[PDB]
Design an enzyme around this catalytic site. Structure first.
Site, PDB file in Angstrom:
ATOM      1  N   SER A 214       0.831  -1.196   0.000  1.00 58.64           N
ATOM      2  CA  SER A 214       0.000   0.000   0.000  1.00 58.64           C
ATOM      3  C   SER A 214       0.872   1.254   0.000  1.00 58.64           C
ATOM      4  CB  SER A 214      -0.908   0.019   1.225  1.00 58.64           C
ATOM      5  OG  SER A 214      -0.123   0.146   2.406  1.00 58.64           O
TER       6      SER A 214
ATOM      7  N   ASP B 119      -0.729  -1.385  -4.187  1.00 62.90           N
ATOM      8  CA  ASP B 119      -2.079  -1.602  -3.693  1.00 62.90           C
ATOM      9  C   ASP B 119      -2.762  -0.266  -3.400  1.00 62.90           C
ATOM     10  OD1 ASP B 119      -4.321  -2.832  -2.605  1.00 62.90           O
ATOM     11  OD2 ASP B 119      -3.323  -3.148  -0.663  1.00 62.90           O
TER      12      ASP B 119
ATOM     13  N   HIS C 227     -12.625  -3.514   3.190  1.00 58.81           N
ATOM     14  CA  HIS C 227     -11.320  -3.638   3.822  1.00 58.81           C
ATOM     15  C   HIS C 227     -11.455  -3.992   5.300  1.00 58.81           C
ATOM     16  CE1 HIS C 227      -8.963  -1.025   0.687  1.00 58.81           C
ATOM     17  NE2 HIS C 227      -9.323  -2.207   0.220  1.00 58.81           N
ATOM     18  N   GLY C 228     -10.349  -4.459   5.868  1.00 58.18           N
ATOM     19  CA  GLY C 228     -10.289  -4.741   7.282  1.00 58.18           C
ATOM     20  C   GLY C 228     -10.934  -6.063   7.650  1.00 58.18           C
TER      21      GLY C 228
ATOM     22  N   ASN D 207      -7.037 -10.264  -2.645  1.00 59.13           N
ATOM     23  CA  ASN D 207      -6.257  -9.380  -1.792  1.00 59.13           C
ATOM     24  C   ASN D 207      -6.352  -9.825  -0.338  1.00 59.13           C
ATOM     25  OD1 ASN D 207      -5.887  -7.915  -4.191  1.00 59.13           O
ATOM     26  ND2 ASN D 207      -6.164  -5.938  -3.174  1.00 59.13           N
TER      27      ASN D 207
ATOM     28  N   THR E  60      -5.238  -8.576   6.315  1.00 55.04           N
ATOM     29  CA  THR E  60      -5.657  -8.663   7.713  1.00 55.04           C
ATOM     30  C   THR E  60      -5.313 -10.015   8.326  1.00 55.04           C
ATOM     31  OG1 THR E  60      -7.426  -7.057   7.382  1.00 55.04           O
ATOM     32  CG2 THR E  60      -7.668  -8.573   9.241  1.00 55.04           C
TER      33      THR E  60
END
Ligand SMILES: O=C[C@H](O)COP(=O)(O)O
Ligand SMILES: O=C[C@H](O)COP(=O)(O)O
Ligand code: NA
Ligand code: NA
Ligand SMILES: [Zn+2]
Ligand SMILES: [Zn+2]
Ligand SMILES: [Zn+2]
Ligand SMILES: [Zn+2]
EC number: 4.1.2.13
Lengths: 291, 290
Positions: free
Chosen positions: A49, A82, A164-165, A237, A240
Site C-alpha cells: 500500500s 495496492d 477492507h479490514g 487481496n 488482515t
C-alpha cells in the site's frame, strides 16, 4: 522472477484459479510470504500500500523484493502497488520498479474513473507495467464491460460485497455471485477481490489466546472465497489475516516471558504463523503446484 | 557511503573518539540506526552477528544496508561481521560484501588465536576488508605481539566487560590501566564489547510496559567516556537497542488489545531505538564528525 502482474493473472484467468495478493510492510512479512510460495510451489503477488511504501521507503520496498526474487528465482513474482490514489503515486511506483499498479478511482463518477484509469494505463503500459482499477463502491456489469474496453486496464476489481479490514459483515457473509459471473462474462479479463481475508478459526483463537481482542470481526468464509474463484476471481487481496496471525505470536511471546527482548524470539514464531496462513490460502485458491 | 571499517576507525583513533557499532536483525533496527546517524551527522558502524545473518540471510543483510547507504550517501558506513567464529564464516561475509569482519578466537591459546586471526587477515586484506580480533583479562604484551604479527586492523582487549544486560553482579569496574597500556603498546583502534549501558529512561520504559530486567546492570556512561579517553574507538552496542525497541512493542500490545497493524507497534519502537543511538553517538564523540 519479477514479472508483469498480467503474466501471472492471465494464466490464472485462463485456467480458473485464484492467486493470493499478500501485503507486506517489512522484511518479516515478506520472508514468510516467500517461504510460503516456495513451499507450495505457488506464484506470488506481493502488494504494498501507499502507507507501507511510506513506512519502508519505496527504494527499500522494491529492493527487498528483488533480493527475495533472486533468492527464489524459480517463483513467478509480481510487485503490485495496492490502492494507488493518484497518477503521480502510480508513476512513482512504475519508476521505482513495480511490475503492477492499482489506481483506485471508484469513488468518482464513471467518466472521471475511466479518464484517470486510462491515463494510468497508457503510462504504465508504456513502461511494461500492468494496471488494476476498481468499479463500484455494487458494480454495474455493463459499466464494467465498457470501462474495460475503453481503458484497456489489465484486471478489474468489481464491488460485489466485500470491504477492507476485518469488520466486513455485520452478520452473515454475503457476496453477489450472479453479478460476478456477468462481469466476468462481459469483460473476459482477470478479476480482483478486495477485503478477502477470512480470519480463520485457528488464527482468531491464537489471537484471543494471546489476550487480543478482535471485536466481533468476521471475514469472508473459505467457501465464499472458493465460490469467488469459481465465479472468475483471479487475484485475492489478503492482508488482515497475515497481521492477526503475526501479532498473535508477538503478543504471546511478550505474555509468556517478561524478560525476553531478543527481536528474533518474537518474530520467528510470528513469521511461522503468517507463512502457514499463506500456504493454506494458496491451496484454497488453487495456486499451489502451479509453477 | 559503504567503506572499509578501518577508514572510519583510523579517523576515530587519530582524533580520539568512539564510534558506536550497532547491531541489527531486520529493517526496523537498521532504519532507526541510519536515521540516528543522519540526524547526529555521525559515522556509522553497522554490524550483524552470525545469528542475525542466519535470521535475515546474508544476501538480505548486505542488500538492505546497501539500500540504506544509497539513501544517505553522505554518511560513512561500515558493515561489520560481529563475532565470526570460523574462517569460512569470515570468508562468506567478505564475498557477500561486508567491509569489516571480526574473527573471535580469544578462547584459544595465544598461538592458535594468532594463527587463525592472521589467516583471516590475509584473506580479508586481499579483498580490501578490515579485521577485528579479540584477546583476553588481556596481557598488554600479548596484545603488542599479537597486533604486530597478525596485522589486524583493530583489537578487542578484555578489560572487564561482558555481553548482555547482566554485566556486573557487584559494582561496575573496568581495568583502565590495562586499557591504556594496550593502547600505548599497540597504537591501533581498540574495540569495547558488551558496552550497553541500559540508561535509566530505557529501563523505566521497559518496566512500565511490564518487562522484567532481572537485576541487570550495564556499563555506566562515565565508564564509556573513560574508555574512549583510554583509547576505545569502536563501542559494541546491542542490548540497549533491543530493550528500547521491545519496551515500545510491549506497551502497544498492552494499551490496545485490538491493535495488529505492525506499523503501530514498530514506528514507536523505531523512534525509541533511534533516540538511544542518537544519545550514544553524542556520548562517544562521533556526533558532527561527518
Ligand atoms: O488496501 C488494502 C490494504 O490492506 C491497505 O493496507 P494499509 O492499512 O497499509 O493501507
Ligand atoms: O556479538 C555480540 C552480539 O551482540 C550478539 O548478537 P546475537 O545475540 O545476535 O548473537
Ligand atoms: Na490492489
Ligand atoms: Na565485533
Ligand atoms: Zn483493497
Ligand atoms: Zn477497494
Ligand atoms: Zn561481542
Ligand atoms: Zn567478546
Amino acid at each position: 522472477m519479477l514479472v508483469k502482474g498480467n503474466e501471472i493473472l492471465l494464466k490464472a484467468h485462463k485456467e480458473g484459479y485464484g492467486v493470493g495478493a499478500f501485503n507486506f510492510v517489512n522484511f518479516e512479512m515478506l520472508n514468510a510470504i516467500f517461504e510460503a510460495g516456495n513451499e507450495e510451489n505457488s506464484p506470488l503477488f506481493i502488494q504494498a500500500s501507499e502507507g507501507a511504501i511510506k513506512y519502508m521507503g519505496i527504494d527499500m520496498a522494491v529492493g527487498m523484493v528483488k533480493i527475495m526474487c533472486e533468492r527464489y528465482p524459480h517463483i513467478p513474482v509480481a510487485l503490485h502497488l495496492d490502492h494507488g490514489t493518484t497518477f503521480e503515486s502510480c508513476e512513482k511506483a512504475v519508476k521505482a520498479g513495480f511490475t503492477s499498479v492499482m489506481i483506485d478511482a471508484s469513488h468518482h463518477a464513471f467518466e472521471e474513473n475511466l479518464e484517470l484509469t486510462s491515463k494510468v494505463v497508457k503510462m504504465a503500459h508504456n513502461a511494461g507495467v500492468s494496471v488494476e482499477a476498481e468499479l463500484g463502491r455494487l458494480v454495474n456489469p455493463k459499466e464494467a464491460e465498457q470501462f474495460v474496453k475503453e481503458s484497456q486496464v489489465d484486471y478489474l476489481a468489481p464491488a460485489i460485497g466485500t470491504s477492507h479490514g476485518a469488520f466486513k459483515f455485520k452478520g452473515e457473509p454475503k457476496l453477489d455471485f450472479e453479478r460476478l459471473q456477468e462481469v466476468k462474462r462481459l469483460t473476459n479479463i482477470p478479476l480482483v477481490l478486495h477485503g478477502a481475508s477470512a480470519i480463520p478459526d485457528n488464527v482468531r483463537k491464537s489471537y484471543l489466546d494471546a489476550g487480543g481482542d478482535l471485536k466481533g470481526s468476521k471475514g469472508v468464509p473459505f467457501e465464499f472465497l472458493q465460490e469467488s474463484v469459481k465465479g472468475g476471481i483471479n487475484k485475492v487481496n489478503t492482508d488482515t489475516d497475515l497481521r492477526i496471525a503475526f501479532i498473535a505470536e508477538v503478543r504471546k511471546v511478550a505474555n509468556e516471558d517478561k524478560s525476553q527482548f531478543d527481536l528474533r524470539k518474537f518474530f520467528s514464531p510470528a513469521q511461522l504463523a503468517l507463512k502457514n496462513v499463506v500456504k493454506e490460502r494458496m491451496k484454497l485458491l488453487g495456486s499451489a503446484n502451479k509453477i
